[PDB]
């Protein structure tokens, strides 16, 4: 017997009824096949199961449970223009959904941490089967996500709304909560969702991804020099001593006037090539390539490559010079590519892609909720026009956030050739 009143929302809600229904059905089909296939693939590859990619199976299973339970209910609700179900279903759907993105949030954090740990060591000796502590991680992730979603199950209920004489059943977080905690949860829910399900995963994953790429860069520079010196051995002690020589070499470069401008201007990979040269000829010898240094300062890669090729250094040690100059030219590790550098590159790509896909899928909806919280005043005279914009962004945000439930298998297919090959075997060859 409770009502609402305006103008702008009406046609947007009706217009988006078909958009929301189509996106949900798309997510349902793409998500059901992609995540089932992903689970199938991950557990079968015993070298995958050995390590961090078992957390990706946790991702896929959590999204699968949301897809099979919550999305059909939402489709029925959209078409019915009412909540046709009972109170139990009203409590179940938001509980399942909140638990599922919690599993996604914590799995992505765990994946970025475990990838960082793997990079930090030399001569990694893997065990057989799922590592015991990764299994503990999975249980903990799922238990915490479920406990955090419990308030949805407690708070949601069915109420009847009267809209201009028409009665509608609506499933929502009940306006009156019984306990003081549940009343606090209702007031704080919107900020809490932004904090735990958006800010926390971005903070954890950005930090550990950054640590991981920094250690990958040091190991790649270490292998670059060892390969160019005819061979050598890695390990924590060997790397630490080498890193001190690198740090000292960069300290020298920053105190020499010819080298600092080109060094500061260069990217990380191209700085390694310049450090490589400093290791071979010393600091003053590198300063001699004024024309070449100028070209690298002005980003003339091909031009700089030719000038370096025409040098005494090139004549004496051509094989090393060719590799160094390719590094300058491409800004990649392709000339020094071995299995270690190959595996480091694939690892960085998959973690980066999954986190970025999560962030972009969810950012519009979180931005919706925030703008509505801070800005929407119904007491402001032009109340209905601002609502129209927020309602449209909220609808877009809902569909884009929903896409993340099916996006990870597709992203893995597109980014990792290992996963792409495994996808083809399971689907195209079945
Ligand atoms: C961490 O979680 C969030 C963080 C920040 C903001 C929102 C967050 O989560 C939500 C979200 N949360 S909610 O507002 O508490 C809510 C949940 C369920 C329900 C019914 C349907 C049971 C009555 C009504 C309201 N609501 C919707 C929503 N979608 C459609 C209509 C009404 N509401 N979408 C979200 O994410 C979109 C992705 C998604 O998967 N949504 C979804 C889908 C696609 C189907 C079913 C249920 C849901 C929540
Ligand atoms: C694998 C992918 C491409 C399949 C896509 C399935 C989508 C497009 C299908 C599945 C269910 C379908 C909906 C089911 C019922 C209705 C209600 C009707 O009043 C309008 C059409 C509408 C809204 C359909 C639109 C198309 C639809 C959403
Ligand atoms: C890449 C994935 C391929 C698969 C895609 C499957 C086919 C979807 C095609 C059309 C559905 C479009 C539905 C969304 C449009 C809703 C119509 C609408 O809102 O119309 C309002 C009207 O203009 C007010 O008068
Ligand atoms: C794999 C993990 C997934 C976990 C999924 C849990 C599913 C069961 C829970 C709620 C469904 C409710 C069904 C709605 C029908 C209600 C009928 C009824 O009245 O009885 C049940 C109620 O608990 C007493 O009345
Ligand atoms: C991704 C899907 C999540 C994984 C599967 C989910 C876990 C299912 C196991 C136990 C249910 C949770 C047990 C605690 C939740 C029940 C609490 C509750 O329902 O409260 C009733 C409320 O008080 C009435 O008003
Ligand atoms: C792997 C390890 C698995 C560990 C598994 C942990 C499961 C959840 C534990 C604590 C969360 C519960 C904390 C909240 C307690 C609520 C107390 C309560 O229910 O209060 C009654 C209420 O006051 C009457 O109306
Ligand atoms: C294959 C599926 C895998 C699914 C794996 C999921 C693991 C969930 C395990 C324990 C969570 C139990 C949560 C218990 C929450 C206790 C607090 C509570 O229930 O509060 C109700 C409130 O008191 C009413 O008024
Ligand atoms: C800052 C807002 C935090 C929001 C997340 C809450 C954490 C969920 C923990 C226990 C469930 C409480 C169940 C007990 C309810 C009894 C009434
Ligand atoms: C690595 C360090 C991470 C540390 C672990 C962080 C995990 C949770 C994240 C944010 C906490 C939630 C903050 C949100 C506060 C609840 C909502 C609120 O602000 O309630 C007050 C209300 O606005 C009055 O009107
Ligand atoms: C120097 C050490 C600091 C290192 C930091 C790393 C930890 C960051 C992790 C989570 C932060 C999440 C913060 C979420 C902020 C939103 C909370 C908020 O805005 O409060 C609501 C509103 O203001 C009330 O009315
Ligand atoms: C592309 C199809 C878009 C469909 C509709 C929008 C859906 C929005 C969700 C995700 C899009 C963003 C995903 C971006 C992933 C980038 C991965 C990447 O950049 O590769 C890593 C490498 O290190 C450098 O390329
Ligand atoms: C996953 C991506 C989700 C898909 C997102 C696609 C972008 C939707 C933008 C505008 C459509 C709705 C705009 C409605 C603005 C006009 C509302 C109105 O009242 O117009 C009535 C007339 O029939 C028509 O304009
Ligand atoms: C229909 C479902 C919409 C969501 C789909 C998921 C988003 C996929 C987008 C980018 C993946 C990364 C592409 C990176 C390609 C870089 C080139 C490469 O092969 O590495």
Which residue, by CA, sits nearest to atom 8 of ligand 10? 203
Query: What is the 3-class SS of 195-242, one letter each residue?
Result: HHHHHHHHHHHHHHHHHHHHHHHHHHHHHHHHHHCCCCCCCHHHHHHH
Is residue 102 within 6 Å of ligand 5 at its C-beta?
Answer: no
Q: What is the DSSP letter of 299?
A: T
C-alpha–C-alpha distance, residues 170 and 165, integer Å: 15
C-alpha–C-alpha distance, residues 148 and 102, integer Å: 8
C-alpha–C-alpha distance, residues 146 and 343, integer Å: 34
Instruction: Look at strands 166-173 and 156-163 and give their pairing.
Output: antiparallel
Buried residues in 335-346 as b, exposed as e (16+ CB within 10 A): bbeeebbeebee
Distance from residue 98's CA to the centre of ligand 1 (Å): 8
146, 177, 180: residue to mutate for ligand 7 pocket, most atoms within 8 A of CB: 146
Which residue, by CA, sits nearest to atom 15 of ligand 12? 12
Which residue, by CA, sits nearest to atom 8 of ligand 4? 92
Say which residues have a Cβ less than 8 Å from residue 273's Cβ, sequence separation at least 6: 324, 325, 327, 328
Is residue 360 within 6 Å of ligand 11 at its C-beta?
Answer: yes
Report the SS3 class of residue 257. Answer: coil
Query: Would you say 401 and 361 are in contact if contact means Cβ atoms under 8 Å apart?
Result: yes
Say which residues have a Cβ less than 8 Å from residue 147's Cβ, sequence separation at least 6: none
End-to-end CA distance of the chain: 55
Cβ-based neighbour number of residue 272 at 10 Å: 25
Is residue 86 within 6 Å of ligand 4 at its C-beta?
Answer: yes
Is residue 33 within 6 Å of ligand 3 at its C-beta?
Answer: no
Domain 8-215+343-424, CATH homologous superfamily name and number? Rhodopsin 7-helix transmembrane proteins (1.20.1070.10)
Pick the atom of ligand 11 nearest to 404's CA: 9
Pick the atom of ligand 1 nearest to 24's CA: 44
145, 147, 149: residue to mutate for ligand 7 pocket, most atoms within 8 A of CB: 147
Single out the residue of 272, 271, 268, 258 nearest to residue 213, CA to CA.
268
Residue 236 vs residues 126, 176, 218: alpha-carbon distances, Å: 18, 59, 12
Is residue 135 within 6 Å of ligand 6 at its C-beta?
Answer: no
Q: What resolution in angstroms, rounded to 1 decimal?
A: 2.2
Q: What is the DSSP letter of 272?
A: H
Distance from residue 69's CA to the centre of ligand 2 (Å): 18
Residue boundaries of the structural domains of the chain: 8-215+343-424, 217-336
Which residue, by CA, sits nearest to atom 14 of ligand 9? 192
Is residue 181 within 6 Å of ligand 8 at its C-beta?
Answer: yes
C-alpha–C-alpha distance, residues 287 and 313, integer Å: 13
Cβ-based neighbour number of residue 419 at 10 Å: 23
What is the helix (H) or strand (E) element at residue 348, kind and residue range? helix 339-375
> DSSP states of 71-110 as a string?
HHHHHHHHHHTS--S-HHHHHHHHHHHHHHHHHHHHHHHH
88, 103, 158: residue to mutate for ligand 4 pocket, most atoms within 8 A of CB: 88
* Sign of the Cα pseudo-torsion (377, 380, 383, 389, in order): negative
C-alpha–C-alpha distance, residues 283 and 249, integer Å: 8
Q: What is the DSSP letter of 127?
A: -
Pocket of ligand 1 (CB under 6 A): 24, 70-71, 74, 93-94, 97-98, 101, 171, 193, 197, 365-366, 369, 398, 401-402
Cβ-based neighbour number of residue 135 at 10 Å: 12
Is residue 353 within 6 Å of ligand 13 at its C-beta?
Answer: yes
Copy the structure tokens of residue 380: 């402001």
* Paired strand residues for 161: 2, 168
CATH number of the domain at 217-336, out of 1.10.530.40, 1.10.287.70, 3.40.190.10, 3.40.50.2300?
A: 1.10.530.40
* Experimental approach taken: X-ray
99, 151, 156: residue to mutate for ligand 8 pocket, most atoms within 8 A of CB: 151
> CA Rg, the chain, in Å?
28
Distance from residue 109's CA to the centre of ligand 6 (Å): 24
């Amino acid at each position: 017997i409770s009502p609402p009143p305006c103008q702008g929302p009406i046609e947007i809600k009706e217009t988006f009824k078909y958009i929301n229904t189509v996106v949900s059905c798309l997510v349902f089909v793409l998500g059901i096949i992609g995540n089932s296939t992903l689970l199938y693939i991950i557990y079968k590859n015993k070298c995958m199961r050995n390590g961090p990619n078992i957390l990706i199976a946790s991702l896929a299973l959590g999204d699968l449970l949301h897809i099979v339970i919550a999305i059909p209910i939402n489709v029925y609700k959209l078409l019915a223009e009412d909540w046709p179900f009972g109170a139990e279903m009203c409590k179940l759907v938001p509980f399942i959904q909140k638990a599922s993105v919690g599993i996604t949030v914590l799995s992505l954090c765990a994946l970025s941490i475990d990838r960082y740990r793997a990079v930090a060591s030399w001569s990694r000796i893997k065990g057989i089967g799922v590592p015991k502590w990764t299994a503990v991680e999975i249980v903990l992730i799922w238990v915490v996500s479920v406990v955090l979603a419990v308030p949805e199950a407690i708070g949601f209920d069915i109420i009847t709304m009267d809209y201009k004489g028409s009665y509608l059943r609506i499933c929502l977080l009940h306006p009156v909560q019984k306990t003081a905690f549940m009343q606090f949860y209702a007031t704080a829910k919107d900020w809490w969702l932004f904090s735990f399900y958006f800010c926390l995963p971005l903070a954890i994953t950005a930090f550990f991804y950054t640590l991981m790429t920094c250690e990958m860069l040091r190991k790649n520079i270490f292998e670059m020099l060892r390969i160019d010196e005819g061979g050598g051995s890695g390990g924590d002690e060997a790397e630490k001593l080498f890193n001190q020589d690198v740090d000292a070499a960069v300290r020298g470069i920053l105190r020499n006037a010819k080298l600092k401008p080109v060094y500061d201007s260069l990217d990380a990979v191209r700085r390694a090539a310049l450090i490589n040269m400093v290791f071979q000829m010393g600091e003053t010898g590198v300063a001699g390539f004024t024309n070449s240094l100028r070209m690298l300062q002005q980003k003339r890669w091909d031009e700089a490559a030719v000038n370096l090729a025409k040098s005494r250094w090139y004549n004496q040690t051509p094989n090393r010079a060719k590799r160094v100059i390719t590094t300058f030219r491409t800004g990649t590790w392709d000339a020094y590519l071995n299995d270690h550098l190959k595996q480091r590159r694939e690892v960085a790509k998959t973690v980066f892609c999954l986190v970025l896909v999560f962030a972009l899928c969810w950012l519009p909806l979180h931005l919706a909720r925030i703008l509505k919280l801070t800005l929407y005043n119904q007491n402001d005279p032009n109340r209905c026009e601002l609502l129209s914009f927020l309602l449209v962004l909220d609808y877009i945000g809902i569909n884009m956030a929903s896409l993340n439930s099916c996006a990870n298998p597709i992203a893995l297919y597109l980014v990792s050739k290992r996963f792409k090959n495994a996808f083809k075997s399971a689907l195209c060859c079945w």
